[PDB]
């Protein structure tokens, strides 16, 4: 009988605290980079304003697809620890070198004298690519920062977690990772604010932005070394579940064969449907609700007063959703928690689009509440936007990562990479393409409200169906693997 502190075994505690610290450090770096990259690529000595859109449209998704293909073969030819280090150490060393060498020597490595010769060579329509060349370093930083948030946060960390955590411990401790994730976001936001202020408070004659960037990248590399040390500690001094002996399988090593299996797998299909539908739903409904919001509050002061209260409610809901998620995971299981998000989004979206499309009929009904139907739509969309963003680290991400645990390591790792790197940017891109198609069809997103609502209905319906099928397959895998382990161990 090993000792138990706080009602939890010391071994599980010893495996969970370093995981929580790793996730804290990872999201600390993620927030620092997510702010540094956009405050950096625009405040560059020579930088077009169409340099970030080009990196969001034509660079982000191809880079994600290329990283998926690279990671598949790397996992095929490397062990778990070797792959983790091979993926994360380049990020850490690049951010350190950028903070200490590449940014101070930015006038030296940037080909300003070449991407004006080639700008007289290639017409102004090619202003896009030329711009990146002109500040390639910073642009690479941007890309790498994006990749960090797409890879180190999702593939690296959560792959490690699903590799070392069982389904029971995942139900017990994944919401408590989101609590701590939010603390990392809070503290990293305060750190970014502190260094933004420090850039100005320090006296003249000093490149305050250079000092702030050096300090922020020093924190980035410190947290990265902390992540590496915690990974080494968990892999050395924590007894990890080995697997069920079904672990043996022919290594595919076919980047065509592996992808063909992933597209033909009914499990990855449903999981990718969840991810894609989540991204599309929040993006579309967020745009529509913000348009209605602007219509509601014409004055600046009222708009900002409402977006103080919205943030306060967002924080309160984040806290209460963390607690409620740790409760529902303990009590009802994976299926209920996986279906809570699409059902609530569906109900709130139906109410929202009903108050939008039919405001006339609903005017007497909402008048009982003392609200203009526009204001009712604003509040419904605000509550939906709150539930959808507060259930990420509490309700959606825990379910998504725990769906990976009962899989075999081949499919686990490969589907993790192919979903959390490629399918999520595809969700965002599909939402954008959907809205653009509605615009080109009907001239405006205001003239496409019924069709936007109908396609959102279809998307969340497919989300619910995928959640149901995924929960069925998830229970099937869990039962099969537990019975197989108990039969081979008997």
């Amino acid at each position, epitope marked *: 009988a090993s000792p138990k502190i706080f009602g939890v075994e010391v071994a599980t505690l010893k495996k969970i605290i370093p995981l929580g610290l790793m996730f804290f450090c990872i999201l600390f770096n993620y927030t620092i980079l997510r702010d540094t990259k956009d405050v950096l690529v625009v405040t560059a000595k020579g930088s*077009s304003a169409e340099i970030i859109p080009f990196l969001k449209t034509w660079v982000n998704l191809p880079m994600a697809i290329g990283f998926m293909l690279l990671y598949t073969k790397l996992s095929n030819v490397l062990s778990k620890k070797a792959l983790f280090y091979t993926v994360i150490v380049p990020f850490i060393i690049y951010f350190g070198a950028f903070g200490f060498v590449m940014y101070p020597l930015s006038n030296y490595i940037h080909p300003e004298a070449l991407a004006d010769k080639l700008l007289t060579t290639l017409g102004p329509r090619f202003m896009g690519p030329i711009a990146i060349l002109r500040i390639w370093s910073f642009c690479l930083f941007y890309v790498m920062a994006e990749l960090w948030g797409s890879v180190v946060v999702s593939v690296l960390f959560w792959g490690f977690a699903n590799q070392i955590t069982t389904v029971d411990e995942a139900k017990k401790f994944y919401p408590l990772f989101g609590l701590g994730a939010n603390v990392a976001l809070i503290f990293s936001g305060r750190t970014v604010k502190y260094f933004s202020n420090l850039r100005k408070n320090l006296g003249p004659g000093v490149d305050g932005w250079a000092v702030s960037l050096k300090a922020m990248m020093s924190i980035v590399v410190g947290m990265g070394l902390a992540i590496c040390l915690l990974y080494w500690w968990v892999n050395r001094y924590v007894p990890l579940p080995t697997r069920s002996k079904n672990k043996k399988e022919k290594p595919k090593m076919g980047t065509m064969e592996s992808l063909k299996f992933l597209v033909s797998s009914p499990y990855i299909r449903d999981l990718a449907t969840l991810v894609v539908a989540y991204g599309i739903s929040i993006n579309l409904v967020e745009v529509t609700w913000k348009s209605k919001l*602007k*219509a509601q509050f014409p004055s600046p002061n009222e708009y900002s007063a409402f*977006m103080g209260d919205f943030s306060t409610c967002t924080g309160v809901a984040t806290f209460t959703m963390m607690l409620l998620s740790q409760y529902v995971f303990n009590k009802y299981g994976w299926g209920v928690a996986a279906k809570i998000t699409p059902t609530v989004l569906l109900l709130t979206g139906v109410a929202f689009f009903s108050l939008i499309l039919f405001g006339g009929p609903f005017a007497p009904l909402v008048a009982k509440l003392g609200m203009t139907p526009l204001l009712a739509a604003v509040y419904v969309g605000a509550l939906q936007n709150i539930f959808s963003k507060s259930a990420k680290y509490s309700l959606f991400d825990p379910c998504k990562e725990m769906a990976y645990i009962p899989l075999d390591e081949d499919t686990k790792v490969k589907g993790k990479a192919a979903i959390d790197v490629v399918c999520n940017p595809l969700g965002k891109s599909g939402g954008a393409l959907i809205q653009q198609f509605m615009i080109l069809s009907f001239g405006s997103l*205001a003239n496409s409200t019924p069709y936007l609502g109908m396609i959102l209905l279809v998307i969340v319906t497919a989300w619910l169906a995928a959640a149901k099928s995924l929960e069925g397959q998830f229970n099937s895998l869990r039962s099969e693997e537990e019975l197989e382990k108990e039969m081979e161990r008997a």
Partner: nanobody
Amino acid sequence: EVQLVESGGGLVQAGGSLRLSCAASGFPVTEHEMYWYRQAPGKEREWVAAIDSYGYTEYADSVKGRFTISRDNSKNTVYLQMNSLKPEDTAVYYCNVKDLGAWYNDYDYWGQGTQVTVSS
């Protein structure tokens, strides 16, 4: 810091055209939603037209069908074309940016405004 400068406001006859231009600096102007407000003397500041990071161009009903907001990423500036102007469009027009992130301290940045007067 964040800098927003408006231009193009002037004196035009009723039924005329006028193109406001907000030049922005110190933040990604293509990644945040840019607003256009107007304020008349004796009245509160009211919203005119916004454009999102995607360029989706939501307008106020008072100017819908006549005004056209358009962000040019090549020149890094937001634009507000005003066709079929009418004498109650006379006001000081401001371009606004909100919620710029943790690197910024105010949550609201405005230009100094540009005067648009429409003569009857």
